[PDB]
Structure formats: structure tokens, C-alpha cells
Amino acid sequence: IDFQTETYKDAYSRINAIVIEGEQEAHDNYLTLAELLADKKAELVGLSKMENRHMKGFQACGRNLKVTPDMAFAKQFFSELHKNFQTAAAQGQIVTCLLIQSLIIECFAIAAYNIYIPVADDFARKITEGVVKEEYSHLNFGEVWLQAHFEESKAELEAANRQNLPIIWKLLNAVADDARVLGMEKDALIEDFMIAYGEALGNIGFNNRDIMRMSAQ
Template identity: 40%
Template sequence: MVFNKPSTPQLDITSAAYRHAYSRINGMVVVGEGLADRHFRLLSRAIPEDQQELERLAAMEGRHASDFVGCGRHLGVQPDVRLARQLFAPLHALFLERDRAGDLAGCLVIQGLVVECFAVAAYRHYLPVADAYAAPITAAVIADEGEHLGYAERWLRERFASVETSAAAIAKRALPITLSILQSLAADLQAIGMDPIELLASFSELFQQALETIGFEPPAARRILAGAAAAMV
């Protein structure tokens, strides 16, 4: 992947360029949080012993979607949900495939590691450039997403010996999809003051940490990330 290093002009949140980019990014956030709600509810049925906890996590994701709709409304911007659904479709389809196959480890890698690491990285980079209305909402969401990541890490770590192969295989399929989403939105991220290069670095660092937390040795975690990057060339 090749990104151009963005300049850092003063943001004008009333400009047409900002509003257009914000519509696309806001759409991704709203749709992504809505899909996370659905994914955690599917997991709650597949992991009955954790049903209450997973339903709680799902409800949090649903509130995030509503809160970010409000962020767009505050700026008078309609989220571009059509684009977001198109960009998220391959990742959602992969989750549903793994759900139908009964591959809980694969589902948790997709939603609990890949998506949550990306969300945490993205929100952390958005927070310094967020408008006054969106900033406290974003800060609260970051804490929530860390909790969701923690659930997936614990579940996978406790079963690592039996899920290692599956987790690695699904990560290698899900990561290129996620990186392609980032690539598609690079110009929009720059327009709202975010650096896609720095976001990619943060996501990669968080995801490698998550892989190591669940049991992968650092060289193996690095190979998974390197394979995803190579798939994007």
C-alpha cells in the first residue's frame, strides 16, 4: 500500500471538502458499529455460557452507532451508508461464513481482534482532530472498544492450543480486506485531519500485540501481518 503523506492545514469543518469526507468516514463508523452489534449478538447465541456478556457488548456497539449518527447530525452531515455497506461487505460475509461453519475462533478473530483493533486505532487518531461535540463521545467509545478487544483476547488465549491454526488462517483472510478499506478511505481520512500512514502503523502495532496476547510468538505474529501487506501489493 502506498499513501501520500498529508499536509496539516487548519481544518474547516464547514467546508464542502471536509463535509464530503466526513460523510464517508461517518458512514463507515455508523455501519461498522451496527455490524459489530449484529456480530456480537450472533456470538451470544453461539457461546451460550457468555450470552449475557456478549449481549451487553452488542448493546454497547448499538449505542456507539446511534452516538455517531448524532455526531454527523451535529455537523449537518448525512452518513454515506451505501459506500460503507459496500466496503464492509466482504468482511461481514467472511464473518457470516465462519459463523455458519461454527468457527467461533474465526468469528472472534474477525470481530474481536481485527475490527476492534482497527476501531481503537482509528478512534485514537480521530480524537485529536474531532470537533467539540464528537470528542467526548469518541473518548468514551475508545474505552468500550478496548473492553471488546479484551473479551476476544481472553477467549482465544484460553483455547489457543486448539484454535491457533484457525486463528492464523482467518487473520490472513481478514487483514487484506481491512487494509483495502483503509486504502479506499485514505483521501477522506486526510481531509478530516487524520494521517492514514500513522493509522496503519497504529493498527498494525495493536493487532500484533493482540496476536501475541492470545499466544502467538512475535515472529509468527509479524509473519501474519507481513502476509497481509504482501497480499495488498
């Protein structure tokens, strides 16, 4: 892969902006969760601080390839997930907030970052490797909490999945062209998100039929 073509820098302007905006949103979402879940404030504040470090690392990736991120593009990209998290937070829907951030968004990131790693430039590869090592703890936080509250959370989890999983599939379809320019196959991204997200639903307490039913939305 040639990291200095106009085609690569163009695609990267949007992808790098998307990760940066995603990291900033995760930082904000974990702080919002620290107010809704007072009991886990220290944990959630620590997760927010990892997200700041991720955001800084991906800013540095962009400057390494001399690419100015298209931050407007990114903000548009996340607007529906952002709006949904906020509407949930505004009503005290902790379970919906956890499903959007800790499960769906972290699964999306884990899938994507692991596909990027073997096609990234050396500097971005090292950064991304450290980020993805941390994103497993984010996912596990949500899995542990929702597992411990499963029966009481189950209905809300199903409704939040119906509402937000279709949003993530649009994002996945929308990024695919630029992701291909970077060397990332779309089918691998779809498959890896569905594996990661199904396994997360399994850990929280959904049976295999329910996972298949939910994966269908």
C-alpha cells in the same frame, strides 16, 4: 480544521457512514457470537448493547455537522468483512468470528478513533473518547477467550488471519483520502492498527516470529 467546508462535509458523509455501519455490524456480530458461544451469552449481549450506544453517538456526530451519511457507500465498504463473518458463523467457526470482530475490527476502530480524537470537533471528540474507552473491553473479551483456547484455536486463527487481514488493509487504503481530509494521517493509521493487532496476537499466545509472519499477510 474547518468543519463546515463542502470538502469536509463530503469526506465526513462517507467516514461517518462507515463508523455507523461498522458499529451496527459489531452489534449484530456480537449477537451472532452470543448464539455460537452460549457459555458467554451475557457478556456478548452486554457488548452488543455498547455497540448500539456507539452507533447512536456517531449518528449524533453526523447531525451535529449537518451531514447526511452515505450509508450505501458504507455498506459496500464492509461487504467483504460482512460476507466473511457470515460464512464463518454459518459453519460454526467461532474462532474465525472472534478474530474478525473482536480482534481485527476492534483493532481497526481503536487505531482510527484514537487518531480522530485530536482532530475532531468538540462534540465528536467527547463522543469518540467514550466509545474508545469501551472498545478496549471488546478487544479484551476476544483476547481472554482465545488465550484460554489457544492451542486448539491456533490453526484456525492462522487461516482466518490469512483470509481477513488483507481485507482490512484494503479498507485502510480505501479510507485514507477521506481520512486525510479530516486531518488523519494514513501512515499513523497503518502503524497504529499493526501495533494494536500485534499486541493482541501476542496476548493470545503467538510468539514474536509468528506475529511478524501473520503481520505479513
